[model samples]
Target chain A: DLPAFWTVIPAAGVGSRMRADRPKQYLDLAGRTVIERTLDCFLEHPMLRGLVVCLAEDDPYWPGLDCAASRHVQRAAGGAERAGSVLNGLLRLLELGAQADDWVLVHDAARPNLTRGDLDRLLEELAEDPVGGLLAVPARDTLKRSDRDGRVSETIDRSVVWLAYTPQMFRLGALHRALADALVAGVAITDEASAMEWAGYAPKLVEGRADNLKITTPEDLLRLQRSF
Target chain B: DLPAFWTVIPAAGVGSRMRADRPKQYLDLAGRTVIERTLDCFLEHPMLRGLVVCLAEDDPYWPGLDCAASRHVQRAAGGAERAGSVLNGLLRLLELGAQADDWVLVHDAARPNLTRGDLDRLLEELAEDPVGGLLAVPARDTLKRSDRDGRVSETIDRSVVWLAYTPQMFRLGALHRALADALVAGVAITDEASAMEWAGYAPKLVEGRADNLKITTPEDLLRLQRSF
Candidate 1:
């Protein structure tokens, strides 16, 4: 049996790029909303201890979700940035009796295509790691660094470059402390892994599939629905 | 009408990652072979002046395709690397009476999903560009630079990072000289744009759809089908 881990979803962002009537997470995916589908993976997993979903203070969509009332799930007031929302969720996890060493998997609300195999692989690979890791894909295409004038400055070494993806796992207290410190120092923490790295931890990188995409645009949502 | 541009496809690689019976360009995409679908975009375009496809020395798949005998399409023997293959195509274009200032759009053989909109947009944007350009997508995910130990070294500034795609557009004589110079100097040139950048030219970054993917593995092929 795998160790039990809590899931913290930072779902407050408006996802302006989506250009939908509602928040992207609230948009319909296949049969359910995007967030519902994103939640189902961990909700069905036996190793999931509990889940905390961070939402905007004025979010009306959360109450309509069937999983909102699930005993295993709780809601937390979200903050402006993703880092802030995640910190709020981490604090909520602590209040829910999570130990300092218990694992916390921070995932994106709009990324609903994550497969079970990738999740299982992530857990298995980082189970014994001192510093928890994230699901990422190695750079497949040639990447270019653009100049201030939007011109190709150089071709980056794709070998050492990786595109960061979610379910970034870490110890609850450790992640909380790292995020809090980074925020306090006004550091631009793009993801949970960046916060951990700032705290001098070398987080592991678990290679995941490219299809596990985070829906950001209307075209992306349409593609995901058509893909099914 | 847009300036008539020649298309050169570098199709030599064995595509070991594909784990297919033949090179990935020879693999079936939808109903047609990968390379055939890739060629159709340019072959059907009104602005296409000529086409050159660079193939392996003993490629048996080339002769079977009906497009092989097209009046506009010519074949060139490919080289060990993509840069060499492209250079060979450039030389072949010159032999076909292509002017020194004539446009050349070097595309990938495995990227069969190039839409007409993207192609037109690329030509439209780079028509007046001094250094030419390539189809690219702005980096959406928070990118990470990995250390030798596969740990997060730092969060790269994604604002100026772009994922380079094709068809990379440039002038025939300029691209030919840049690629030859780079190859002789033993510089690591991954794409035609990189060779131009090394020669102190800033290639423009033309944004394209994310679906324009280069098939590298079995899973990619599967995804491409499902996406359609």
Candidate 2:
């Protein structure tokens, strides 16, 4: 008993922090590339209607992935900003005859550790909610606030602090409008939740595993390799 | 020149979160017990004058490890409270002919991922500073403040948020006094830095690797086992 959903993966950036020759999504993960593994999360789901992958213009790597042949996924032009890239993916979803009220999950292309359990949890937690939310993990360590001199200014209340993760779920038409308006307002939207917040919506916080890591650096890649 | 130091590792509590038979410190790491691997960090360093490990009264596990016979390390009675156990370890250091102002690193028994580069970086950065600090990593993900009902209330400023890690370095005299005073005042001090801050000191934030993880959960243990 699950609602059907479309997915938008923003794979437009070079991921310079990884310092890899290719973007992180194109890098090897287990046997496949990171994006292939990322796509597996949705493409394998029974409830997935379709997916949109936003990639850079003339990006050479996407064609190399065998899963690029997936009939369920379509390509869209990458935009300069992340929100813009996601908006383009949503536009592509609309082109594929998707309804505006359908759930659109915007996930990070580099964050491949997202497990089925967490994904289902995100859906289950927000399925009947008035507004959609993203997966996040509570900050477990001693959360400190640093001063201008990089000294400990204060200890934050960890109970309320969370690290935002992706697979941010939202209704396509409302999310599209929010992102569209936020962009026009030049709002400093860090995530889909931020843009939605800009549109005066309060998103829920669905807890997920802390290991839903976004591949950012060489060490991160090494950690994932060692674990996998 | 590196500043000479002592280490106090509180290994009292049974790490019930690990859901293991023995405490996390006694659990097998790559080739040895977690505590053995943790001891290797300081036992390998030249600047370590001596080290103290706090253990439960009549704890049966310590005698089994061969490193237990090391002349550089001594065991202290683990008190009921962490601050009390640390206080006992500090007293043991005093009994070992250590000066009051000597640098004392309060480290977690299960945290074995500390590297020499980060360790030296902390010592080097704080060698001449007025106040010593703990190793910390700035929160890279978009931070959020949750509401009472566990919804996203606000997005936190990530630029100033840090995840506090060890070894938290401070002078034996100052840290000991801070812990003692804070315990008496019933202040909820999560770490040594919090106690120091309660005493109106701004502990420096020495940036360290995010992987300097403390083994708190089964997944965390699996991650470490996979990495090493």
Candidate 3:
């Protein structure tokens, strides 16, 4: 069983690195657009209270998507940065009558490989924990901290290092405040867990498969679709 | 022009994680065994001075490979740990007339996907450098350092962090001395570079493709072979 949670996907960027004609989210994977496959993962889950997809202001591509008309999903303006986009989603959840303590799962729009097992495991493990965490994979290789001149300065103890993935789950009110304050304080927030960390919370780390890639460059796009 | 160097392939471990009847190095990829392809990367290079493959004491699979009788390759006994196995390779190189100042490239037996470009780039970039380095990939994901209980302790600065890969290149005398001393002092040497690091040397970080995977499990084996 999974806890009831609202979902947020920040699909705002133009995906310049993708070098594609359209944003990577709108790019086709097999039959449907990438965003469609991403949304399908959450839409089928009964425990999903609602969902918000934050898109760019007047993003010309959004109105034509088939899921654009879905009743359960709402749209919000994407922010300049990802944290702002997530903050907007949390604020919109407030208007939809979500409680402060309600769980919010923020995911990447291009990471459509989210399996039911991975999603359920994240929800299941953090259901009772006071502080939430994000999906991460144990680094398959030794990590090095390099000096400015490009020489490795140190070999990080790899047993404790994990590569952060999504969907990062946290309490809506706490996350919203964390992101809002961090942005004002000029603290760099890479993921939702980082914001929570700055607010004095120790987010847990949940292991996931490295196959669940957030498609960015052409390499990832081709790599993911090869097996799809 | 590349430096004339010796090559070491540590094929000692029985590869328990592979869990197959044969070691992963002997597993079929296309037609040739995995280690055969790995050896070919260096065997054909005209600048290559010699090669040493440290295999298990009585590895059943090593005798069957056609390369076993190849003129350019030598066989050495492997040790209990990888550091000792590599040290054995270095000692064997000395008997075969390899000089102390010569470069030695150490690669994994199952990592057969290293491209010529990646190999040459690593060589070309570090050709004149005083300190040696290993091929690495800049981490594409944010990394989190977890506490003992698996909660986030710190968010590492991802900008300077790199995941170590092969073939790690270093001078024979330096690497040999480092591994020997580190082993005697009970240091945990994860890679050749780590042993070098333990000896107060900062190995340079050379960038490479993430596809150069040392096939450990069923997943990486499948992933690498799917492309072949």
Please give the DockQ score of every candidate, comma-separated.
0.54, 0.63, 0.61
Off by over 4 Å in 2: A14-22, A218-228, B15-22, B218-228
Residue range B82-194, candidate 1, lDDT tens digits: 99999889889988889989999999998999999999999999999997999999888778889998878877888889999999999998998999999999998888998
**Could you arrange the candidates by lDDT from highest to lowest?**
3, 1, 2
Q: Could you tell me which residue pairs clash in candidate 2?
A: none
Error of 2 at A88 (Å): 0.9
lDDT of 1 by residue, A129-158 (tens): 899999999987788999888898888888
Instruction: Report the lDDT tens digits of candidate 3 across residue range A1-228.
Output: 689999999988653234446677887787788889899889889899999999886777777888888897898878989999998898888889899999999999999889989999999999998989999998768889999999998988888888899999999999999999999999988889989999999999999878888877544565566545
Q: A107-145 in candidate 2: lDDT tens per residue?
A: 999888899999999998888888899999988778899
For model 1 the local lDDT of residue B139 reads: 82
Lowest lDDT sum, 10 consecutive residues, model 1 chain B, at B13-22
Report chain A TM-scores, every model.
Answer: 0.92, 0.93, 0.94
Q: Between candidates 2 and 3, name the one with more favorable DockQ.
A: 2
Q: What fraction of the native alpha-carbon contacts across the interface, defined at 8 angstroms, is recovered by model 2?
A: 0.88
Which residues of candidate 3, in runs, are more than 4 Å off?
Answer: A15-23, A26-33, A57-65, A221-228, B15-22, B27-32, B57-65, B221-228
Off by over 4 Å in 1: A1-4, A13-34, A44-47, A56-66, A113-131, A181-187, A197-202, A217-228, B13-34, B44-47, B56-66, B115-117, B124-130, B184-187, B198-201, B217-228
